Swiss-Prot record, chains A, B:
Belongs to the microviridae F protein family. Assembles to form an icosahedral capsid with a T=1 symmetry, about 30 nm in diameter, and consisting of 60 capsid proteins F. Upon virus binding to host cell, one of the spikes dissociates from the capsid and the virus interacts with LPS through the exposed EF loops on the F proteins. After the genome had been ejected, the channel formed by the F proteins at the unique fivefold axis remains open. This is Capsid protein F. It is found in: Virion. Pentamerizes and interacts with H protein, G and B pentamers to form 12S pre-assembly complex. By binding with protein D, induces joining of twelve 12S complex to form the procapsid. The procapsid has an external scaffold made of 240 copies of protein D, 60 copies of the internally located B protein, and contains 60 copies of each of the viral structural proteins F and G. Upon genome packaging, interacts with protein J. The mature virion is composed of 60 copies each of the F, G, and J proteins, and 12 copies of the H protein. The chain holds residues 144 to 285 of 427 of the full protein.
Length: 142, 142
């Protein structure tokens, strides 16, 4: 999202915020669309290079990995056994994360017409704790 | 060195002796020059034999090994899990081996002109011990 100014983002993207991804299903987490279903190695007319073939496989491997898991530098790095500071790739630092399921209770209708009818009331008490944190430089915590 | 007589070997080869190999570097221990950089398998025009290919790889393997490590019978044998007497391949038997680094000291010049000048003097005491050895047959110990 290379939006320059909020006056550039879709009305509802900046009203309620941009759309997050659905929870992993089979159809809701397809393989990367640019995912190769085949790979050609230009061969000779009546011979193939047994050693070239080998190599062909080594390259496709490196490609496949980038496609499926290391689409991120910080990611192609980690698989090298190294690490990259959130300062190497200018990524906001995730300080804390809370997740929970919100619930509530049903309200029973009791008049002549809506007796046997209910309305679910979702009241969920939650709490989130961001442990003390040392701010290296000036910035915002979102 | 298939020299017949010393009158056949180069002047300096038989004056001071034949040249030994440099100490392993990157450029001083290249891969065998006859080392294959590719290997063709003659394929059909619009099909390859998936099983033939497999085989192709088995042969190249045996070739590659001979090229890199078993250029010697006694060597292609050892990788079979066997052994060959120095009598199987008529090789001189290495009885003892000593290796060391020779050093010395510098001599300080002290006249008007060579005061601040030095000459390195390499005096190295060494010793070599050939443990007792049972001579099976008549021969020379070099």
């Amino acid at each position: 999202l290379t939006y320059a100014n909020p006056s550039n983002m879709p009305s509802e993207d900046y009203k309620w915020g941009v759309r997050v991804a659905n929870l992993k299903s089979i159809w809701t987490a397809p393989l990367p669309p640019d995912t190769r279903t085949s790979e050609n190695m230009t061969t000779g007319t009546s011979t193939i290079d047994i050693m070239g073939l080998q190599a062909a496989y080594a390259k496709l491997h490196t490609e496949q990995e980038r496609d499926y898991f290391m689409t991120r530098y910080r990611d192609i790095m980690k698989e090298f056994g190294g690490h990259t500071s959130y300062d190497g790739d200018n990524r906001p630092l995730l300080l804390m994360r809370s997740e929970f399921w919100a619930s509530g209770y049903d309200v029973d209708g009791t008049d002549q017409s809506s007796l046997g009818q209910f309305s679910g009331r979702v009241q969920q008490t939650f709490n989130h704790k961001v442990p003390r944190f040392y701010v290296p430089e000036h910035g915002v915590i979102m």
